[model samples]
Target: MIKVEIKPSQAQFTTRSGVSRQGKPYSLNEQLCYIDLGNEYPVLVKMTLDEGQPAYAPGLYTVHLSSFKVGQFGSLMIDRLRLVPA
Candidate 1:
């Protein structure tokens, strides 16, 4: 079985107005992608933002997933996810 890993360069928050408020713009700095691991294996997912920085302003932000494709032989299964605020 092949292991696939996805990570963000930096973490940032977007306000209701669709603007970056805190943290660095990860999506803009790096390329985001995900994999679809069929039913064979369970995908472990984790999210995090830059630490040692001021917390993001209180507001409603939309979490966006990066675009990705599944491998030729494996399936994608995602479970057990969490978001931490600092």
Candidate 2:
């Protein structure tokens, strides 16, 4: 399980009401997430946080990831997960 807490920060923007808002808190969980199956298959999964939670103020912020685990067989990976202004 990976839990990310995304919150607002005011570290860069100058204009208070002109900056875009950030997304909400979201979590991703995986169990036995196979990266490659028998060396013949590849699996990919994605989780996203839409505009369902509170919008964050622009600037620098912190995202917390919890309960992170890395597999020991084949390859364990997490691909491009990003937070963009909305």
Candidate 3:
């Protein structure tokens, strides 16, 4: 586990319309989470979208950070994101 600071000023939650694989228009929702980790790590991280958590604010946070492979995108995905207020 690691500690981080939520950069709420730089974060956002929005929906973007896109075409689905089934050839249908769909809305994709996401949380643009920004943090105060080192420059080597990405500032924008992934969080639990369906967990029904409250909006994040600027404060100390704990996270479960990790990375995994993404075959479809031919790249790696940084996941294991858990935000807990401290």
TM-score per candidate, chains pooled: 0.20, 0.22, 0.46
lDDT of each: 0.34, 0.32, 0.59
Candidate 2: regions farther than 4 A off = 1-47, 67-76, 79-86
Ten contiguous residues minimizing lDDT sum, candidate 3:
46-55
Best model per TM-score: 3
In model 1, where do residues sit more than 4 Å from their true spots?
Answer: 1-47, 51-54, 67-86
How many times do residue backbones clash in model 2?
0
lDDT of 2 by residue, 4-81 (tens): 223233212122222335855544332111123335654432333232333334333223332133556646443334
Per-residue lDDT of model 1, residues 1-86, tens digit only? 22333434323432222346684453312122233357665354343333333333333223323222355667643221222222
Please report, as a residue range, the 10-residue window in candidate 2 with the lowest summed lDDT.
9-18
